[PDB]
Amino acid sequence: MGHHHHHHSHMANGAAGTKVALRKTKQAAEKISADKISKEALLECADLLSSALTEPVPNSQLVDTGHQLLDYCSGYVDCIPQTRNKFAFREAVSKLELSLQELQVSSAAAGVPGTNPVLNNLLSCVQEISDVVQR
C-alpha cells in the first residue's frame, strides 16, 4: 500500500511525435509486426469482440479491444490469396472501423448493455471477418 504516489500501472508515456516517422512505409518483414499477425491470433482477437458485445462492458473497453483488429486486419488482408475473400475482408474491416469510431462518440450511456444498435453492427462485422477467413 502507498498513499503518496497512488497510481497503479503508470507506464511513463512520453513520446511527442518522435515515435511517428517511417511508419508511412515498410523496412523488413522480419521486424514488421504485421508479418507476425497470425491467422489464429486474429480469430482469437475477434473472439474477444464477439464475447464483449454479448457481455456488459464499458464503452472504453469495447472500442479499445476492437481497435486492435484494425491493425491485424490492415496488415493481414493483403496476404489473402483469394481476391473474393480479400474484398469481403476489406468491406468487413471498413464496416468495423466506422462502427467503432461512431460507437465511442455515440456512447452516451458509456456502460449500459444493449444501449446502442452499433454493438450488434460490430457483432455482424466480427462474424463476417472471422467467416471470411473460414472461407
Residue 133 falls inside a structural domain: yes
Q: Name the nearest CA neighbour of 118 among 98, 89, 94, 132.
A: 98
Here the CATH number for the domain that contains residue 99 is 1.20.120.330
Residues whose CB falls within 8 Å of the CB of residue 78, separated by 6 or more in sequence, listed in order: 86
Element (H, E) at 69: helix 59-76
Q: Name the nearest CA neighbour of 82 among 29, 46, 135, 38.
A: 135
Q: At what angle do helices 59-76 and 118-134 cross, to 10 degrees?
A: 30
Cα–Cα distance for residue pair 25/102, rounded to 1 Å: 28
Domain of residue 58 covers 33-135
63 residue type, one letter: V
Cα–Cα distance for residue pair 83/57, rounded to 1 Å: 36
Residue 76 falls inside a structural domain: yes
Question: What is the CA 109 to chain-centroid distance, rounded?
Answer: 21
Cα–Cα distance for residue pair 53/50, rounded to 1 Å: 5
> What is the chain's percent helix, strand, coil content, to nearest 5?
60, 0, 40
| Direct distance between the N- and C-terminal alpha carbons of the chain, in angstroms, rounded to an integer | 52
Residue 63 falls inside a structural domain: yes
Q: Name the nearest CA neighbour of 62 among 84, 54, 36.
A: 54
Technique of determination: NMR
Residue 101 falls inside a structural domain: yes
Residue 64 falls inside a structural domain: yes
> Number of folded domains in the chain?
1
CB-CB neighbours of 55 under 10 Å? 9
Element (H, E) at 10: none
Residue 67 — left, alpha, or beta (φ > 0 → left; ψ -120 to 50 → alpha)?
A: alpha
State the cell numbers at 102. 461512431
Separation in Å, CA 71 to CA 27, 64, 75, 89: 17, 12, 6, 13
